[PDB]
Amino acid sequence: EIGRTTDPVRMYMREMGTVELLTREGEIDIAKRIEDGINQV
DNA sequence: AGTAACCAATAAATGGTATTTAAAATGCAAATTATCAGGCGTACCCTCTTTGCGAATTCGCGGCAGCGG
């Protein structure tokens, strides 16, 4: 479908649109996993 | 109201060759103050959205393209 949109801004927004937000639970989940990795090392 | 240029003489006529004198002044490189230029950090919560709107009704020409026997 790509209409050869050479505009880099369009490519950036198209790439970033895929990943979806998640709040109040993930942040805690990922922070815990980061601290766990650091504690392991 | 007194002739000399006679021959010695006198040092003054210069402008030229230098190791000095130390005082100055003139530069020189430190110490020692001001001020400028970087780095870091900030805990309520905030989540694609802004754009260009059109190097702006050109036009004529060419040719490298996709569809098609």
**Residue in A28, A30, A2, A29 with CA at minimum distance from that of residue A15:** A2
Answer for A21: CB within 7 Å of strand B.
yes
Q: How far is the CA of A14 from the C1' of B42 (A)?
A: 33
- Give the separation between CA A32 and CA A25, rounded to whole angstroms: 11
User: In chain A, how many H helices and how many E strands?
Assistant: 2, 0
Resolution in Å equals 3.2
Provide the experimental method for this PDB entry. cryo-EM
Q: Distance of CA A37 to CAs A1, A7, A10, A23, A26, Å? A: 41, 39, 36, 22, 16
The DSSP call for residue A31 is H
Q: Is the CB of A23 under 7 A from strand B?
A: yes
